[PDB]
RNA sequence: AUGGAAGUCGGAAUCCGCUAAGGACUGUGUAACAACUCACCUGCCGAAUGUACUAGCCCUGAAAAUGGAUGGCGCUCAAGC
């Protein structure tokens, strides 16, 4: 039921970040030195990473909140990294690159504002927005039959997909909230979800030894990737959208290209 | 069993109902008007439930 | 109970022919059955069954041993 | 009465006089009561008594050996699925019953 | 002219630790408003942390003291950030204590402690410390304690 | 007298609370204990605020 | 959603620690958040309390 | 007369000794030598 | 037998010790021998001793061993052969009963002066003679049972009511308060706890802890001690009178 | 496995007198004589010293043995209650009705008898007969007590149980009525 | 953590000192304390015991319905094994 920050160069422990009372199932880092957690105790936690103390506490969803994801996830994890293929030469440089695309990722109405999704094992979701709302979600997202597992803002901040046990993963408008279409054609529950770096594409890999990949603008199966001879556990896309790679109970790891 | 043990309580009747902080003499006051036998204590949180 | 002052219908000891014959086949058929198990078990059986040993309470125990391992010697020096 | 009315005349009152004793007594006497009760109860009763009985005493050394051993998942899951309900899991063409009871057409 | 002497326990920074009070000091004859400012006066070296104080009661007065405890001196030395107990409940103390301010609160319960040397003083301070959850020196108090007991740490002689 | 242990400006504060649930009903605060405390003895202001 | 809100909550919270001697349930569950809410929601339960009842012996 | 309580009030009950009716028959000297010989040949 | 009484096992965390406690005390015995000048045997018959406890912190400079007495006595060497330090078997003659082992490096002197001026009150043991005579009045029984005035006591928890009358007090339970006979001490005599000259059983020592009463008092009585350079065993006032073996 | 031999003894103080004969044990004292048979038990009683009672069973199974230990509290009981005799206390508690306690000596038995009337209002009057050599008396020192001494500690204690019996609670919660008579305190007269 | 929760409504840890020995407690109890009790230790006592299995014989290990059956009387250091 903690997070600890760690100093890498040293590896000591600056902050213990306590107060939940189940498992923290995942956390992220924001660009604005908040840590978002999500716990068993079905609470959803924003902590001031320079301080370590708590910000807010959201207790909306009704069971484990599974996953946790930030509107510019996609531009934190890369940093400075993009499709121009050259770094800045420089540190102060590289960290103002990081930086734009990050409040570029993250602007709101031409305000910095991180939107934060929780998903959790009360079939629902729920959108925070804590800079502008507090503790007030923007939208509570319903439709999912069963708990949801996986979700994932698009790269450009228009969409939000979810999976979901009910064999089916679910595409919401990144704003407001509001259900747009189902993704049909898993025959067991979905675990992962991933997004192409241009927003049309969402590949989906379930417990029916599949992936999917699935053209979001027209809402349709774009292509099916069969292979696995188990379960698949992990999916991912690369930032730069050559390969996709997925791995799972059958102990080897499978690459995808076009 | 608790729903055995409630008190009955009429609420369409001529009623007096005492509220407040604890330690403040309800149950003083309502054990000198009536006959129930409700505790009188120093500490707070005596009464647990409705008498 | 109200054994003593009012007992039940007794339970007969006397035998019938038919249950004493009925008795004695199903005996047989049973004790050929066993065979027919055993001749079939599966199950592992050692070579050598685990020997008990000597008791402690027997008195002599001790000297018995000195035999022993006396005798595991002889036989050592013959062999 | 009200609430804990009982509660409150025990507070208020107490207990019979003899009532610690005789609670004493009659849990000093349950061993020749559970002996008399396994060797002079009959039929049915008698035979659930037994496996009730058993059950106790199974339970009783499993507790005990667990009081002895105090001083002294398996398949690979993600963290998504830790801490859930998870199964335990554990050329010739043959099915699993190749032979069963052939039955007559008149039965 | 006669003395009472009255234990409690007691947030530091808070007023309402007079709440039980005054059920009992009233007869006495004592000022709850009074002697809850005056406990909080004492009291506001240890804000947020549970403390023990006593209080002596003589001609209807009463003066505060605040009694040292392991626990109360290990989570002050863990120094942890400020905190609404209100707000942010099911806390952890799980930072690190130097093995000096370890001794320090040895030294400080020494007035407590029953052991004929600082080292036992300082083997029961980490027993306490082990209880609380933080770490020593960054492993385990426990671990720590053995080292002692073993021979790998010496403790200083008073 | 604030010998229940807490304070009276609490109770008002409290009173004042749960005073839209009193919404057509009759209200009566009872000054309790005036063997320890008179309401003549506290100052003006406090009992400005009672009245 | 209700063919499982009831199970739901009996995983988010067992029969055992909500009452009975071994509870450990503090806080209810409320349909109101401030006391002027709950003014106005005893209001229409009462209101509707006596509807049905008007219903009923109608019925 | 009696300095210790008898749990179950029968204080004219008098101090009994153990049923040992097998008392008697081996001394300790002997026993203790049993033991030591008992030892070794385990 | 198949009659037997059936044997409770304990799921607590305590096991009972054995021989391993036996070689400890040997083992913590015979290396505290050497470190110290002088081995005072002391004696407390038919005393609580929790008090033991506040002597070890006040003479946190010796050592004070306080274990069986066969055993200590085994430690020491009760043979001139088998004696750890030269005349110690001198020493293990006044080792019968409740004693104890205080091995220190003071002067003698310091320690008969510490122990003459050790004064403590205490709760009575059975078979101790009464000095007074002790009577629970009539009416509400109250903590102390009469030895504070009633104004300044409290009244007795009324848990202790049928404890009380297991004791043998005609205790009784009006409107949650323990009364001895009736509320206003009516139509029954004071309780007589003990009478002065009375041999305490344990019963009345009992009562006598549970009312508060001490009768008694805690008092360590030195009978000798051995001195390491000398080798020669000095006999005391008390080990003069007291039986030896 | 039968036991060759087995002893029990029982000391006799000074001022008693006791004779077996046939197994029929009489002893006699300053308080009285009690008399009891014991010819359901095989023994050879014998004096094995002065003011010592031996006790012996030959050739005796587990049983026989343990039957001793039985004949010496018995007999030991006999010889404490004609010197010392016993006393059972008992209390009589009520909550709204008063117990009423009448204690008569028959002239014609010579037994007492203990009459018990308003327990809990019942109009019945409740009689109980005492056991021969067992008085009865309501103690003066005490509130609501009754004093049952004898010679025979089973008279006593049989005496006792019967009041104790007699005044029972039918078809109540007794965790709410408490009242009855109980025996409060057992021990010696003298 | 709790309105309160001091070993004993709960969750998780379960260490040290003094030790002869004593659980961050086995139960009773309190609103919470207190109080009592158990584990463990010492003194008194006095010599053999404890646990689990195995083998015999005995009891229970399910019975309806006219009155009845070791063939019957009856048998108990057998007239049973
Ligand atoms: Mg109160």
Not at chain 1, 4 to 12: A, D, E, K, P, S
Not at chain 4, 64 to 82: A, F, G, T
Request: net charge positive; charged share 30%.
């Amino acid at each position: 039921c903690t997070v600890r920050i760690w100093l890498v160069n040293t590896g000591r422990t600056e902050h213990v970040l306590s107060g939940h009372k189940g498992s923290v199932s995942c956390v992220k880092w924001g660009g604005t030195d908040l840590i978002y957690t999500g716990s068993h105790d079905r609470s959803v936690r924003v902590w001031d990473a320079v301080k370590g103390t708590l910000v807010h506490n959201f207790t909306a969803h009704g069971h484990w909140v599974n996953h946790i994801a930030l509107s510019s996830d996609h531009v934190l994890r890369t940093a400075y990294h993009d499709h121009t293929k050259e770094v800045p030469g420089t540190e102060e440089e590289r960290r103002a690159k990081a930086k734009e695309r990050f409040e570029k990722a993250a602007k709101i109405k031409g305000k910095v504002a991180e939107r934060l999704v929780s998903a959790s094992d009360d079939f629902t979701m729920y959108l925070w927005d804590p800079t502008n709302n507090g503790s007030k979600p923007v939208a509570r997202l319903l439709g999912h039959q069963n708990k949801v597992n996986h979700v994932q803002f698009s790269p450009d901040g228009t969409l939000i997909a979810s999976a979901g046990w009910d064999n089916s993963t679910k595409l919401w408008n990144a704003r407001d909230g509001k259900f747009i279409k189902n993704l049909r054609g898993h025959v067991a529950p979905v675990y992962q979800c991933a997004w192409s770096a241009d927003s049309r594409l969402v590949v989906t890999g379930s417990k029916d030894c599949t992936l999917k990949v699935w053209n979001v603008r027209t809402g349709k199966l774009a292509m099916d990737l069969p292979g696995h001879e188990d379960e698949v556990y992990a999916v991912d896309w690369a930032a730069d959208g050559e390969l996709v790679a997925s791995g799972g109970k059958d102990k080897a790891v499978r690459t995808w290209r076009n | 069993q608790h729903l055995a043990r409630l008190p009955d309580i009429n609420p369409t009747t001529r009623t007096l109902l005492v509220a407040g902080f604890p330690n403040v003499g309800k149950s003083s006051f309502v054990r000198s008007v009536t006959r129930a036998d409700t505790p009188v204590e120093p500490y707070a949180f005596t009464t647990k439930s409705l008498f | 109970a109200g054994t003593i002052n009012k007992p039940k219908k007794p339970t007969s000891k006397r035998k019938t022919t038919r249950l004493r014959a009925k008795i004695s086949k199903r005996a047989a058929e049973k004790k050929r059955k066993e065979r027919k198990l055993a001749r079939k078990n599966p199950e592992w059986r050692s070579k050598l069954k685990k020997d008990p040993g000597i008791p402690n309470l027997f008195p002599y125990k001790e000297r018995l041993l000195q035999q022993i391992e006396e005798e595991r010697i002889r036989r050592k020096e013959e062999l | 009465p009200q609430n804990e009315y009982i509660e409150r005349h025990r507070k208020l009152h107490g207990r019979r006089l003899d009532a610690e004793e005789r609670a004493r007594k009659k849990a000093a006497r349950e061993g020749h009561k559970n002996s008399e009760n396994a060797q002079n109860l009959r039929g049915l009763r008698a035979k659930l008594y037994a496996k009730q009985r058993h059950a106790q005493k199974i339970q009783m050394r499993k507790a005990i050996k667990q009081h002895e051993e105090r001083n002294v998942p398996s398949d690979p899951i993600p963290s998504y699925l830790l801490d859930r309900a998870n199964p335990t899991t554990a050329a010739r063409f043959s099915v699993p019953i190749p032979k069963v009871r052939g039955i007559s057409e008149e039965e | 002219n006669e003395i009472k002497i009255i234990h409690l326990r007691a947030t530091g920074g808070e007023v309402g630790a007079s709440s039980a009070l005054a059920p009992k000091i009233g007869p006495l004859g004592l000022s709850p408003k009074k002697v809850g400012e005056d406990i909080a006066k004492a009291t506001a070296d240890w804000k947020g942390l549970r403390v023990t104080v006593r209080l002596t009661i003589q001609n209807r007065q009463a003066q505060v003291s605040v009694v040292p405890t392991a626990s109360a001196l290990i989570i002050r030395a863990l120094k942890e950030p400020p905190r609404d107990r209100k707000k942010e409940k099911n806390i952890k103390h799980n930072k690190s204590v130097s093995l000096d301010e370890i001794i320090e609160i040895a030294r400080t319960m020494r007035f407590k402690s029953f052991s004929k040397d600082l080292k036992g003083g300082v083997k029961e301070i980490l027993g306490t410390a082990f209880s609380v959850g933080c770490q020593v020196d960054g492993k385990s108090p426990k671990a720590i304690s053995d080292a002692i007991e073993a021979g790998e740490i010496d403790i200083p002689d008073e | 007298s604030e010998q229940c242990g807490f304070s009276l400006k609490a109770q008002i504060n409290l009173f004042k609370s749960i005073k839209p649930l009193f919404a057509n009903k009759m209200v009566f605060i009872v000054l309790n204990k005036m063997d320890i405390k008179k309401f003549e003895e506290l100052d003006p202001e406090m009992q400005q605020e009672i009245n | 959603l209700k063919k499982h809100q009831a199970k739901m909550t009996i995983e988010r919270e067992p029969f055992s620690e909500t009452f009975g001697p071994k509870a450990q349930r503090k806080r209810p569950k409320l349909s109101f958040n401030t006391v002027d809410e709950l003014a106005g929601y005893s209001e229409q339960s009462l209101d509707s309390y006596h509807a049905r009842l008007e219903e009923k012996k109608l019925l | 007369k009696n300095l210790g309580m008898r749990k179950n009030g029968q204080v004219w009950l008098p101090a009994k000794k153990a049923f040992r009716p097998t008392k008697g028959l081996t001394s300790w000297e002997l026993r203790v030598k049993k033991r030591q010989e008992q030892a070794a040949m385990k | 037998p198949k009659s037997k009484r059936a044997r409770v096992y304990h799921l607590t965390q305590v096991n009972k010790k054995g021989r391993e406690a036996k070689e400890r005390l040997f083992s913590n015995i015979r290396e505290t021998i050497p470190k110290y000048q002088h081995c005072f045997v002391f004696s407390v018959d038919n005393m609580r001793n929790n008090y033991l406890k506040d002597v070890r912190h006040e003479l946190n400079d010796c050592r004070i061993f306080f274990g069986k007495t066969k055993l200590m006595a085994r430690a020491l060497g009760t043979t001139p052969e088998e004696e750890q330090a030269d005349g110690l078997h001198r020493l293990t003659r006044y080792l019968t009963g409740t004693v104890g082992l205080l091995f220190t490096n003071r002067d003698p002197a310091d320690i008969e002066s510490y122990f003459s001026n050790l004064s403590q009150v205490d709760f009575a043991r059975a078979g101790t003679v009464a000095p007074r005579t002790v009577t629970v009045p009539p009416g509400i029984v109250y903590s102390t049972g009469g030895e504070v005035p009633p104004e300044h006591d409290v009244p007795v928890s009324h848990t202790l009511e049928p404890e009380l009358r297991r004791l043998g007090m005609p205790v009784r339970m009006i409107k949650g308060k323990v009364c001895l006979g009736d509320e206003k001490g009516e139509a029954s005599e004071g309780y007589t706890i003990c009478k002065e000259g009375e041999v305490l059983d344990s019963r009345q020592t009992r009562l006598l802890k549970l009312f508060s009463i001490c009768l008694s008092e805690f008092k360590v009585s030195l009978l000798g001690y051995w001195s390491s350079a000398s080798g020669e065993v000095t006999e005391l006032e008390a080990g003069k009178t007291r039986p030896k073996r | 496995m039968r036991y060759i031999h087995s002893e029990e003894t029982i000391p006799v103080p000074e001022n008693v007198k006791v004779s077996i004969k046939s197994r029929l044990v009489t002893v006699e004292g300053p308080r009285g004589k009690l008399q009891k048979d014991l010819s359901h038990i095989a023994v050879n009683f014998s004096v094995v010293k002065k003011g010592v009672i031996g006790l012996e069973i030959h050739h005796g199974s587990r049983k026989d043995v343990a039957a001793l230990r039985t004949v010496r509290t018995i007999i030991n009981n006999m010889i404490i209650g004609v010197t010392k005799g016993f006393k059972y206390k008992m209390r009589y508690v009520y909550a709204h009705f008063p117990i009423n306690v009448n204690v008569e000596k028959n002239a014609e038995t010579g037994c007492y008898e203990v009459e018990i009337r308003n327990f809990i209002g019942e109009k019945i009057v409740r009689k109980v007969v005492m056991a021969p050599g067992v008085e009865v008396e309501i103690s003066k020192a005490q509130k609501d007590e009754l004093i049952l001494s004898g010679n025979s500690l089973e008279a006593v204690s049989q005496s006792a149980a019967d009041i104790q019996q007699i005044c029972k609670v039918r078809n109540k919660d007794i965790r709410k009525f408490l009242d009855g008579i109980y025996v409060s305190e057992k021990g010696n007269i003298v």
